[PDB]
Design a binder for this molecule. Structure first.
Ligand SMILES: Nc1nc(SCCCN2CCCCC2)nc2sc3c(c12)CCC3
Ligand SMILES: Nc1nc(SCCCN2CCCCC2)nc2sc3c(c12)CCC3
Ligand SMILES: Nc1nc(SCCCN2CCCCC2)nc2sc3c(c12)CCC3
Ligand SMILES: Nc1nc(SCCCN2CCCCC2)nc2sc3c(c12)CCC3
Lengths: 396, 396, 396, 396
């Protein structure tokens, strides 16, 4: 067992390990598209003597963070150890090698989507966004008087075939991802994939329809087995008007009993209805996980709340450095120091604060984040908070 | 049909309407205890010609709000219209009469627990706290290295009969409710009720056990039908140590597969585990609903974030007044003005911001809260936010 | 934390730990009856500083083993560690102390019923009997021509109130337990308990009825929630005639769709029907677990198959001795030796072979039982096998 | 209605009756393969006046019986009566005709797989092997210290595409079926069928993967609807090492919660784990059914336990002959006699004892097997028992 970059002849073995390791694997001729996002030296394989018994890679991604700043981001994915080589330390070896390469390439952060919430904390990854399934019983749903877009005169929302309005979706998503923390550049090849999932499958998923507004879209389909449920796969809205308009259209799906969507905890949909409770939260999970690769480069890159006054402190990341952190005017300066640490935390905890989805107060309550001054805790809390709520772009 | 204060001879008719209207009604000799919390002229009945076809009352409560300030609070409850007198405007008449009496008595706020999330918005009530059911699969649960109270040496947590350690629970709850927004004074008679629910029922609920720490307690019981589920009815912890210690004890219930609890969205339990995901959010609802009875008295009474700098603005509540609002140094001054409104909202929306559980940004996104300056929105957001997270005390 | 025999004043604390540790606990005034089966120095408690945080005891039992031989048996039960004192090594301390006392008292074997199949292997306990739930769809059930007791003329089976025919049940059970491996003497106090479970509970279990034959009985009751299911709590038959007669009566319960019973894997009921498949096996578990306390005393006490010819060998139990074992004429001689071991196994594996419910071939296939001669394996297999099939008496 | 051998022009009508009679029918161009195993005069059809309203056939099979002896075996299958011709005695006519031809061809035994356990007893078929579904919760599964193949150094097990390692599977199965009672020669055409079921179906079964050891294999696939369940379709192991190695690989399927397999009651898997209970028995049924066509030829062909001493007796099969049976040195001599019968049974009961999966004691308890000497019962029991446990090869 040795660690190597895969050659063209390894990929068939990687696809076999993929098929056996991921229930949701989309076959090799669709994995061709994701491969384009893997840089030269983005992948490691472990061979036995030889078949692939281990693999991991990263993709080149652009992640939006608070202050509408776009970071280069190594997206970890396609991580797998053969069932025949468990408890052999292959993951520890592969992750160490990719993190070496990710750091040496100058990525300030790495990101992934977890298959279990227990594996990735020990490698410096912290859950950074929260998924929120809302299911609406749309038979009872009435919009509030105060809701926009309920006036006698035209609807701006159209029902369309997704495949025929790609450019409009691309345009809206591009505007969306640039102004929202958690947003990812979605390259051409993943739009090719998204619109091939939109056509009906023989004895699989049903036809996907689109609701198109000048400033937003929604892709939805009826569930395979529950024919009274509509699953909103993706809703992107740039303006509050577009968000409300699109929800009026979805509550107008009179053949459905329930609309379900995976959104963020600050989704305003409940407040659009006369009865907040009709939009039930039916499921919550960690979305994107973040590993801060370079602490000073990442803390300096994002914006901070203009509301909190200027303040200084010393932050220690366990096996990650000690830094004089000064925050004011929504910018941070982060420099090396040997001064006494006022605030200590593991690198994963920093990942979790970074997009401003978890409050420092909460992590401190669990002792994930040590300090002896609670004034500094309130300040971190307010500084790291995000004006624009954190959303999740797409699974990779 | 006329509106009257009930006399001693009306209560049997009220109890009949209660039994027919509330599935969870606890019989008349236990309703005797709650009656003590109803002031003279706290109740209205509607008689037909005569049996009770309508009733509503308020109880005298002390609600803790941000800045560890305790408000007198009218707690609405025992609201019911006979199934024979629907769409007759009896609720509108009864609520109007109680709100007249509540206001004239000098209560700055009123509060209730909703049976539906659609009834109470139009009477000025806004959902103000969020309930969060966490279910833990305790077979997989491992505490983090960073977690307190996992060191060789004594446990401070004891397993006890609830009935034999009342004074200790009372002491801990009193300390808890005084330092947490949403906290309610729990009077003697509701401790009498809480410990009568703690004994096993013939073909009903099972025996309740207590986990007692110097600085916290947990009441739990095994579910009636699911014998592998433990329901934590109530966990109160004053210190992070007490909260962690009590959870180590609950994960130690080796005969159970799952521990469920109703807590708040900022509960640190997920962050105590190596796997955040093992604490699944299985259910979310509006907890306490708030009606601000006197806008200037309530905005002046609570504390605000010291982090946001001093700022002034003009707030209009629909049919509720217009006020020059100046906030700085965590105090607010709120005075009458006829100046142009910068910020507008219905009274219910104010109820929802008041305990700092909903962000103004979120309500603004839904157009529940109108302004043309987004800088002022960020400021409201930060000012009204609560350092100590908002919890729910007990249903009334 | 120290290990002590409990005094009369400890038992209230033990009952508290019991109530919190066992979902099926029957309250203290019924635990009074089982207490009579606990000898002086049969119990250990661990106190903290003081409440009971740990307890274990054994009861004096008479277990029937192959060759209709009755062994004195320490029955372990009432084992519990407080949820506040997990991973503290209290079980290891308590089990060590009881095993010291059990051995020094001259018990050749100890036995228990497991709450998990993973705890008790490391303390020398092997699963020794197998439980088998058969559910019959009695609407389709027809007895075979070859079945006894289907002839024109009287039925010998009567439907009776259990409480009125105690002596007859006692008589039949006494005959049953003396001729069946796994049989236990059931003392007077556990008959007092068995017939108090036979009366209907308010919002609990339904009335128990009895089917009484001269040479067997069946206790059954309709399920709480499934009113088309009859649960046979206990069927004891001395003669094949009695077993068949009692099943004709149970298939005659025309208001029921299904009869369920927990029996042994060799129960002949399937072979009584024209359709073997109508008696579905719906559930299987380990019944009684056995720890051989004195290897030579236990191997010498039981009978062996007369069919296998005389043979000698050397058996090593890990940390349990090495013995020259000679078996012939259904007796064994077991003496100390330092000669080379032909057969090796952990003490738990011996427990599992002892009642002849597990085949040595099967344990050898799993490498629980090492030898290099497969002829000796066939011989062990045949010797240790039981003519009369192994059954489970009652849970303790 | 008359009984005829089908001509080439009957098969389309037979396939229609098949499609309407068997839910699991695989279409006509796959039935082409099984047809090759049907000898000339292996099939009967009943025509009405003309469409096929009745059919039955046998296939030429080689069944392994105790003593690693291989019998020619008529495998009954494709038995069907049109729903329009029930209770017309067509099955009785067709079975009589095939049994005439099977006997006259010199097959000592016939075998089938039942669609109901109630049809086939009256035609002389006895259930002879037992199926056992084990489901493992693989999250908790830990192998015992004593288990083979858990040492630092290479795994001998590989994850492979089934279609690319046919010869290896064939080799291992050939070795397996020759040394195990219940084993069947699997001809080339049924390997062609087995590896066409191994590829993913559009809106059907998922891709099948293989775990390959030098001395064993496992075919598994994720369930259609339960994506956390892996179904092991087939596990064949020649050595205990291979069996353990393959189970370590299956417990290493970390994306699955549960591994299910259909195996035999003596499968050693439970004993490989620290917790026997984690391998739950979730389902049991009759596997292969056996009809002894020639009693003396079949009793003479198989081996018997060498452990039981030489003994003689007289066996009567109802309408099947009376025989002087002498068993010693694991051989039997079976000759015609008119001497008094010591042991009587229906032919089906003999089928059930023949592979040594049912104990004579058990069948005697049900009066399926009459004798007045219980010493002779113990001897039959031991003689007919099988050293190597009885397994089920494949459904036909
Ligand atoms: N990165 C990829 N993603 C996907 S689908 C996203 C599934 C999300 N998971 C992600 C993990 C668990 C939760 C949910 N497919 C492929 S194929 C292929 C790649 C790749 C990389 C290069 C070859
Ligand atoms: N206030 C009371 N509460 C209760 S139990 C709390 C149930 C919570 N509900 C509250 C509403 C819906 C959700 C859940 N019982 C009684 S009796 C009695 C009173 C009263 C007042 C005076 C006579
Ligand atoms: N030995 C006892 N048994 C029972 S009920 C049997 C339950 C079976 N379990 C046993 C374990 C798990 C499976 C199923 N109750 C009591 S009270 C009391 C004793 C005792 C001892 C002295 C005070
Ligand atoms: N013998 C065959 N088997 C199968 S699939 C095995 C199904 C098992 N059943 C068997 C019975 C019920 C339980 C389960 N298919 C065919 S097609 C075709 C034949 C045949 C014979 C000649 C044309």
């Amino acid at each position: 067992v040795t660690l190597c970059s895969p050659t063209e002849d390894d990929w068939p073995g990687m696809f076999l390990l993929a098929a056996a390791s991921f229930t949701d694997f989309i076959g090799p001729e669709s994995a061709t598209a994701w491969r384009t996002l893997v840089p030269t030296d983005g992948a490691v394989v472990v061979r036995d003597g030889s078949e692939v018994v281990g693999m991991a890679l990263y993709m080149d991604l652009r992640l939006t963070v608070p202050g509408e700043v776009v970071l280069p981001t190594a997206g970890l994915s396609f991580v797998a150890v053969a069932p025949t080589h468990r408890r052999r330390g292959l993951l520890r070896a592969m992750c160490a090698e990719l993190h070496r390469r990710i750091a040496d390439s100058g990525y300030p952060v790495a990101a992934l989507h977890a298959s279990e919430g227990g594996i990735y904390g020990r490698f410096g990854y912290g859950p950074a966004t929260t998924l929120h399934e809302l299911t609406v019983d749309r038979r009872f749903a009435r919009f509030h008087a105060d809701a926009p877009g309920g006036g006698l005169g035209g609807s701006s929302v159209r029902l369309v075939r997704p495949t025929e309005h790609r450019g409009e979706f691309e345009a809206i998503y591009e505007r969306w991802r640039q102004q929202v923390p958690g947003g990812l550049l979605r390259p051409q090849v993943l739009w090719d994939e998204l619109l091939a999932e939109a056509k009906a499958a023989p004895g699989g998923d049903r036809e996907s329809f689109a609701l198109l507004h000048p400033d937003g879209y929604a892709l939805y389909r009826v569930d395979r087995t529950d024919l009274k449920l509509a699953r909103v796969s993706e809703l992107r809205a740039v303006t509050a008007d577009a968000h409300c308009a699109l929800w009026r259209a979805l509550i107008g799906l009179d053949s459905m009993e329930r609309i379900s969507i995976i959104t963020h905890p600050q989704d305003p949909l409940p407040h659009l209805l006369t009865d907040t409770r009709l939009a039930r939260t039916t499921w919550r999970q960690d979305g994107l996980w973040l590993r801060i690769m370079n602490v000073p480069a990442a803390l300096e890159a994002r914006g901070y709340a203009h509301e909190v006054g200027e303040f200084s402190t010393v932050l220690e990341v366990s096996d990650g450095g000690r830094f004089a952190l000064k925050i004011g005017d929504g910018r941070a300066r982060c420099t090396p120091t040997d001064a006494a640490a006022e605030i200590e935390m593991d690198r994963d905890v920093l990942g979790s604060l970074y997009l401003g989805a978890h409050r420092a107060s909460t992590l401190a309550a669990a002792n994930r984040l040590r300090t002896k001054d609670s004034q500094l805790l309130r300040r971190l809390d307010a500084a790291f908070a995000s004006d624009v709520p954190v959303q999740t772009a797409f699974e990779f």
